[PDB]
Design a protein around this ligand. Structure first.
Ligand SMILES: Fc1cccc(-n2ccnc2)c1
Length: 209
């Protein structure tokens, strides 16, 4: 049972600007998703300090980067706090509305596009490199869900029947044809070292066949 939703007009506008604007510095998408993963890991760690049972869904706090040339996907997995269905449909878009407006106005000041992360909308930078994004997520208080969007003004949410996650978020980037450099080990390594060197969680870059 797949539910289809319209993006807010302001978010659809942000996604169109990300997709259509000429901007060569696309590698910043990985810094933003890793930063999002680190934030989600901070949240479940802090919650576990007053309720150790919050880690019954998984004690390990980590980030995995998994490229797959056969599927042309780059997957960013974290074991953070995850996302509820209300997060996917409503809450995150609500925050992203004001952040988008501030991001556009900041751009007219002296801000750079690479500062998208300071406005709570760094997630949408995934569309610098992906033609489709699939997000599998599991929050302790909700079921496992699959969010998916190829932009174009709409996204879908469904209950996920696949392998159970325990807890956390998996962002699957279905890469554009000309963006396969982000499946290369040496390229991902270079980006993590340049932009994510001091993340306080183990980042494991998986290698392929
Ligand atoms: F996985 C998703 C689905 C929908 C929105 C978001 N998101 C995160 C930050 N701003 C927006 C993430």
């Amino acid at each position: 049972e797949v539910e289809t939703f319209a993006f807010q007009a302001e978010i659809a506008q942000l996604m169109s600007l990300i997709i259509n604007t000429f901007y060569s510095n696309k590698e910043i998408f990985l810094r933003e998703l890793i930063s999002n993963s680190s934030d989600a890991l901070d949240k479940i760690r802090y919650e576990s300090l007053t309720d150790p049972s919050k880690l019954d869904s998984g004690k390990e706090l980590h980030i995995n980067l998994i490229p797959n040339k056969q599927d042309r996907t780059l997957t960013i997995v974290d074991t953070g706090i995850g996302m509820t269905k209300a997060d996917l449909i409503n809450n995150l878009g609500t925050i992203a509305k004001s952040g988008t407006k501030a991001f556009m106005e900041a751009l007219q000041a002296g801000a750079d596009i690479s500062m998208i992360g300071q406005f709570g909308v760094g997630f949408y930078s995934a569309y610098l490199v992906a033609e489709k994004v699939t997000v599998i997520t599991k929050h302790n208080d909700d079921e496992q869900y699959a969010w998916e969007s190829s932009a174009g003004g709409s996204f879908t949410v469904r209950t996920d029947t696949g392998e159970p996650m325990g807890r956390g978020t998996k962002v699957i980037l279905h890469l554009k044809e000309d963006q396969t450099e982000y499946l290369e080990e040496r390229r991902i390594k270079e980006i993590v070292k340049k932009h994510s060197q001091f993340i306080g969680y183990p980042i494991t870059l998986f290698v392929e066949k």
